[PDB]
């Protein structure tokens with residue numbers, strides 16, 4: 001739903017990188033260069049941003065039961 | 067000593083609904099209502 | 114019979130990782146030191162969350178979990194704090210915890226990013242890794258959603274919960290060339306050279322060394338930002354030294370306890 | 372519902388001996404050391420250090436059941452040197468090795484930063 | 487008995503010497519003997535034929551001991 | 562002048578340990594020194610092995626006859 005805080009396999013913090021990754025992808029970076037820019041070297045960490053789907057953006061479309 | 071506050075559906079506005087009252091929103095008359103979060107202590111391990 | 118004479122040589126030291134080489138030590142000692150880096154190295158992490166009010170699309174436990182995983186700058190306070198279970202005070206106190214507060218409400222039209230900058234702390238030395246780069250996204254809020262919670266960060270270690278694991282990735286490796294044949298390759302030439310291979314591009318693996326022990330254990334300890342990466346290693350050594358001092362105490366007592 | 376709390380891998384209960392020694396019956400000079408609330412982090416170093424002792428005939432360890440917080444190190448040495456002291460010494464000096472490592476790493480670190 | 491330790495411990499006999507203990511196969515071994523350095527011999531209640539190999543094992547072990555450690559003694 | 566097999570069937574041994582254990586649980590006197598075990602099954606087993614169980618097996622034959630065999634008379638298998 002929301003980007004995981006830490007990579008499940010090793011523990012590297014990746015929760016602070018989804019917005020950055022989106023900005024890099026807003027530029028014409030290829031997702032592989034984007035991942036290198038964000039410093040994700042191990043494939044376990046790269047799997048986090050490549051495979052993440054941000055569903056919280058869909059869940060926010062609904063009006064809240066304030 | 068609470069009159070039993072509920073949250074409307076399409077309105078999202080707190081209405082006081084006592085027992086033996088029909089569930090109708092004070093405004094627009096929507097029939098769906100949700101209870102507001104408990105006041106009891108909520109504590110998690112964050113695990 | 115007596116203790117062997119270990120050595121160390123740091124090859125790279127950054128604020129994120131340390132690459133070092135240990136000589137004259139056992140295969141078991143080098144792996145136990147690795148294991149301590151993962152499990153038995155204390156750090157501060159949120160372990161108690163009182164959710165006053167949560168109307169975000171994320172659930173109370175979801176929020177709690179995410180808060181638990183946020184790394185806190187644990188460099189001097191962690192070696193001074195008392196384990197919460199060991200602390201004598203009722204509830205929490207500065208001697209055994211760091212209080213955190215996050216009271217946030219979205220009123221502006223645009224969606225609010227509830228990052229770790231909203232996690233206010235009762236101590237100036239223990240805060241999310243934000244000293245000096247974006248922040249860990251905790252929640253996304255719509256107009257009219259809120260999140261108000263109190264939290265306490267406890268001293269713990271990675272053997273109890275992964276939250277207290279100070280490392281991102283530990284690269285333990287020894288004998289880059291297959292000198293001891295501890296691993297047997299069906300086709301040794303299909304395998305890329307290790308980063309530490311003292312081997313030319315001609316030969317595939319070092320010639321078999323019959324009489325030879327593993328030494329020169331290469332490490333790459335990467336921190337999650339909680340502990341400085343060299344302090345993780347020092348914290349391992351002090352903690353293992355304590356484990357052996359205490360175990361010898363209990364053993365000696367058990368010998369006299371006949 | 373039946374999940375054990377994570378603390379049970381290291382927190383001592385009421386009555387639990389940190390270590391329990393029992394003599395082994397099948398051979399002379401052999402004991403079984405049973406550590407409670409410990410695992411392979413402590414089992415591999417003690418096993419390996421025991422093997423450097425030229426007076427240690429046998430040294431090794433097992434975790435009787437992985438969900439049981441108990442490990443068994445077994446030591447058997449020459450008749451002129453009890454297993455108890457074999458264990459004691461291998462820790463007496465293992466502590467020294469880790470202190471020696473601490474001292475040597477601390478100087479290598481201060482030597483790397485601006486050096 | 488000589489070699490009995492003055493504290494009443496018989497170990498100077500059994501730990502230096504190959505002991506024997508004759509019991510039925512079924513009987514749960516004696517706790518002192520199981521702690522002591524003594525060779526158990528298992529006998530059947532009804533199968534008399536299985537007795538001969540047991541005693542042969544006795545003479546075998548005894549001869550091993552006599553020849554390795556007490557061959558200088560006279561037979 | 563009995564013709565049944567002089568060996569104790571696995572069923573006979575089982576039902577003997579079952580019944581004798583239950584009697585011991587109801588503290589009928591035990592025929593052999595307890596070294597200190599307390600599980601009635603372990604005591605019943607010890608009795609059996611010492612051949613002191615006070616039970617005779619009434620073995621019915623298909624024709625209607627029967628032969629009483631003391632537990633101490635026939636041979637145990639295990």
Ligand SMILES: [Zn+2]
Pocket residue numbers: 007008009010011012042043044045046
């Ligand atoms: Zn990873």
Ligand SMILES: [Zn+2]
Pocket residue numbers: 074075076077091092093094095096
């Ligand atoms: Zn309404």
Ligand SMILES: [Zn+2]
Pocket residue numbers: 200201202204205206207208209210
């Ligand atoms: Zn406290």
